[PDB]
Design a protein around this ligand. Sequence first.
Ligand SMILES: CC(C)CCC[C@@H](C)[C@H]1CC[C@H]2[C@@H]3CC=C4C[C@@H](OC(=O)CCC(=O)O)CC[C@]4(C)[C@H]3CC[C@]12C
Ligand SMILES: Nc1ncnc2c1ncn2[C@@H]1O[C@H](COP(=O)(O)OP(=O)(O)O)[C@@H](O)[C@H]1O
Ligand SMILES: Nc1ncnc2c1ncn2[C@@H]1O[C@H](COP(=O)(O)OP(=O)(O)O)[C@@H](O)[C@H]1O
Ligand SMILES: [Mg+2]
Ligand SMILES: [Mg+2]
Lengths: 552, 573
Amino acid sequence: FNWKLFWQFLHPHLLVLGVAVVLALGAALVNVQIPLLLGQLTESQNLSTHLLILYGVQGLLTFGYLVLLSHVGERMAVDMRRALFSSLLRQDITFFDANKTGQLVSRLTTDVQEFKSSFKLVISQGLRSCTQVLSTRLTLLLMVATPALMGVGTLMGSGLRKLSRQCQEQIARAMGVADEALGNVRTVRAFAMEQREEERYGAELEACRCRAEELGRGIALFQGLSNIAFNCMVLGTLFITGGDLMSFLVASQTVQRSMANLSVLFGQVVRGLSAGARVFEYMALNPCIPLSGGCCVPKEQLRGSVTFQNVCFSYPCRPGFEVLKDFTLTLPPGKIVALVGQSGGGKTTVASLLERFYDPTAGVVMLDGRDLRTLDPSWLRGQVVGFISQEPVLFGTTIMENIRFGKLEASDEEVYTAAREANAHEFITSFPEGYNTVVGERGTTLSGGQKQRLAIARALIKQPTVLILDEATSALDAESERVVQEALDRASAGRTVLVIAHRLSTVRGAHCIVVMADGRVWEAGTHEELLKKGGLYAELIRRQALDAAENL
Amino acid sequence: FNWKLFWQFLHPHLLVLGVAVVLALGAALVNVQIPLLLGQLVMTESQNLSTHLLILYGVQGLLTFGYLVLLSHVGERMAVDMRRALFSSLLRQDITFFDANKTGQLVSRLTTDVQEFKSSFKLVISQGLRSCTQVAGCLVSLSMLSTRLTLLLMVATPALMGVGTLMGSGLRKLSRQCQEQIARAMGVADEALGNVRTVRAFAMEQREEERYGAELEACRCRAEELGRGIALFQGLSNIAFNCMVLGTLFIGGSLVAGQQLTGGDLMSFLVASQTVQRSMANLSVLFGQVVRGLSAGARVFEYMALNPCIPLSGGCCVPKEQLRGSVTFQNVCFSYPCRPGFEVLKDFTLTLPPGKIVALVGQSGGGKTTVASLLERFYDPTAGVVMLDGRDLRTLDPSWLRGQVVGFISQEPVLFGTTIMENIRFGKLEASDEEVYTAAREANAHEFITSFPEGYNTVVGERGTTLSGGQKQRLAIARALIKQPTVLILDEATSALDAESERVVQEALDRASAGRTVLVIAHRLSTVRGAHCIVVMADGRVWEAGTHEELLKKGGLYAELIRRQALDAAENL
Ligand SMILES: CC(C)CCC[C@@H](C)[C@H]1CC[C@H]2[C@@H]3CC=C4C[C@@H](OC(=O)CCC(=O)O)CC[C@]4(C)[C@H]3CC[C@]12C
Ligand SMILES: Nc1ncnc2c1ncn2[C@@H]1O[C@H](COP(=O)(O)OP(=O)(O)O)[C@@H](O)[C@H]1O
Ligand SMILES: Nc1ncnc2c1ncn2[C@@H]1O[C@H](COP(=O)(O)OP(=O)(O)O)[C@@H](O)[C@H]1O
Ligand SMILES: [Mg+2]
Ligand SMILES: [Mg+2]
């Protein structure tokens, strides 16, 4: 896994890598003749011009060998970042709840560069140092191979890998304290608890040093023992022609100086290998639910009948705490089914199961008789179901491209037709640039009602058969709430709609209402049926009628 | 700024740093006697010398370990002092900065850039000290009084070229352009992975991979340009040194014939320069790290030196006996620093009586939340003044005001990743366990907190138990009540709350609003009906003002708002 995947990225760049080896051997080959011709120095002018040619040749051989190594290292990094980001996006929602967004961005950009630059330095110094280095040759090569093997034959006992893993654990822990403090700085200032956050970070900061000093003392232990191991190798080979033994002792002294350069970079070797291990860690991960694995149903066959049969669910984070318990509900095609209940009853959880973000622990969820497990998730989310959350998410691009997120192969004329259906075209045209206006952090800040109107137009381009509306008009102002709801009803026409609303006034004219308590269907039926039943709905609407009469 | 602040962190660790220099000079000193004593060796006579040589190896290894440990200790302790000073300076920066700079990039500059500099500083001294001791040992042993000056000059030449190019318009602009694209591609990943749920909902994953992939090839493009640039310096530096050898050979050679310098000195210098060439080559390899390290080190000291417009402790405190709670806005004009042209607040004049609850109503984007942020002194007005009991907020201690005088309640509450008891305790730092429960009972929070298995020891947030909108807001009320506020801001506290939860939270807020100056910015006009007076905002100015009955009799903006509310109420019946 560590070296099996590493070879896959190195293999295409290996041809370019070989050219740099030749250039490095040739560069130090010119360096051998440099003091040779210097010792020899009209006779002077012929030799001085000759020496100036050799400097430019060595300087060109060194530059090229360093440029090729920088090119191989950077191109290998892009292939790793491309493969990791693709594998990260494929990962299920359970993983994104367990792992912070900040640490994932760091593993994708910092850890890759930490390995890349470390890989560059080991070959840059290694190749240069090794080029500076019949019977004496065999004994010399034997002494170079020993610290490369012995540094692994000793790594079997105490593990420098456990020290770096403990160091990376505290590095991410202190990183999360800074992200929570600086990210919610406005809330920190509000209650003027800055010195408390500095203390909370300061404590994690001294622990950050503590674990790094332990690894630091560990890396220094290897470097020190490696110096003793080499000097003992000299004494070992001395006891294991007389002119060869005499020459070898001077030759080992030259290797000792060259091996010392690699022993200095051992700290980078640890840091770099630990870095790349984390890059290949999340790259190999396979999610529970795939993205392309399934079957598609044509628009001529798809009617839009959603059926939940004895669906029991519990989140993978809390396997004990049951969210949905024996939940049975069937949505008729074209009919608008309302969903009412207490906060924490599993309302938003029901919706996420239909979008197939998670699969039930018991029972099945079916779309027109076909189970969602056998269906293609990308097809279901991207062409069948249209989701609308209580808080809309707008990317850092233009308004025209932000709506175009619904259907990839959608024309410019398709966006304006979709925007007119969600009463968005009226206020978008009013802007100076209009549809070419950027939105988000860098772009123009938009009101709650304006943002939600854009989200409706986004979900309408893909022409959905099923529509989920989870508290679409939650934190909207009285005026904006009336506008957005009016456009939502127009989009609800001729579609299967699962309305999860807080305002009971909009769910009064639905196909049927589903009251939910402790993840179970508590009450079900039409508006009149649930009033005649005298249940939870009747008590809820009784309190609603008293509040309404008081406002008149 | 780059070196002026750098010396402040290096100065206390300089004493420990000097000890490591001595250990490195001693370790290479033993390495000189290693082939000297090994050459003497080439049964009892051998046993006495072999045991003696084994002692020398253990002494060399101990001097190598200690020198590396001291350098790791100095480097790590210096990093903590830098991270402590940067985080403190980052939190002090005004809100304008946090809107201009992303939270992710600030975390990276605080952790990654510090470690990028620290490990780079570690490597330059690790190789540099080891390599320089190999040169110092050869210099004292071979060179005479005249050959020493020529040797030291040849070492100082690439160092003069080294620093000079790093300060220039070449390498410095290439790394700045590389860091610009590094942060740009980082923002694409953060927007994609951060909003992954929305990306999946519309199944546009291949579009996000393409958007990142384009920024990823540009990330290589700018880094390859810097890579080709750093390699150009390394190559030219190799030519520069070999030309220096040719230069001193002709300069010194002219003095050799004139009996000024012996032939043995010139011959020794050429062997000495060849030893330095091998030592300088080790530092030339690390030049890529020198660029990377200095660029990252500059970014850390850039935001550390920054001074905000509004301080945190600079001001005066008003005693509880003098503090009544009278807020006054006198011809207050405000335009955000981001949009200096777009005027949000124009000639705002409002006075809040002490103990009285003043309601604030207006259209979405009329500058309602903007008024609230000016009272919390997040920003200062472009014209006019905001006064607390006759005293201007500019002369007042900001931390005293936010931490003891004003109690803010936002439409979306923010709960940290700690226990419930510690999350409420965010109000008053020196608050007892008994103070939290008394505050929780005042916000109807104690009733549902005790119901939990662990209770107050239950963690909340991402790792903790997820709480309902109404439950989260009830905790925020109890948090703001510990500091015992004189002024209270309620900005749409019951916005995204369910009909049932909305009635509970308001029932608590109303009791908390008793005997305090309250600025209620509510969307539901039904709760603002029983206030001291209602204010109406139009295009950033006070359009209509007066009591509930007064504004109805006036027949203005409030009358048209209460008319649309009456039509919505009849539809709910
Ligand atoms: C942490 C503090 C104390 C150091 C901050 C100053 C740096 C900007 C200096 C210190 C040592 C300098 C280095 C000392 C030696 C060299 C070798 C020199 O290359 C050669 O002479 C090699 C020639 C060859 O290839 O034969 C190129 C500049 C460089 C890397 C210098 C670049 C600038 C450095 C890193
Ligand atoms: N990501 C999650 N991880 C763990 N528990 C969750 C998660 N999302 C929701 N829950 C839990 O599931 C239950 C119902 O959630 P949800 O459907 O979001 O609420 P609501 O009925 O208000 O829409 C609650 O007990 C909540 O804590
Ligand atoms: N951080 C900000 N940067 C730039 N403009 C802002 C910012 N916050 C608010 N505004 C602008 O100020 C105006 C009023 O804002 P605000 O008080 O938040 O609205 P509301 O009246 O709905 O509460 C709007 O035009 C809005 O775009
Ligand atoms: Mg919900
Ligand atoms: Mg507001």
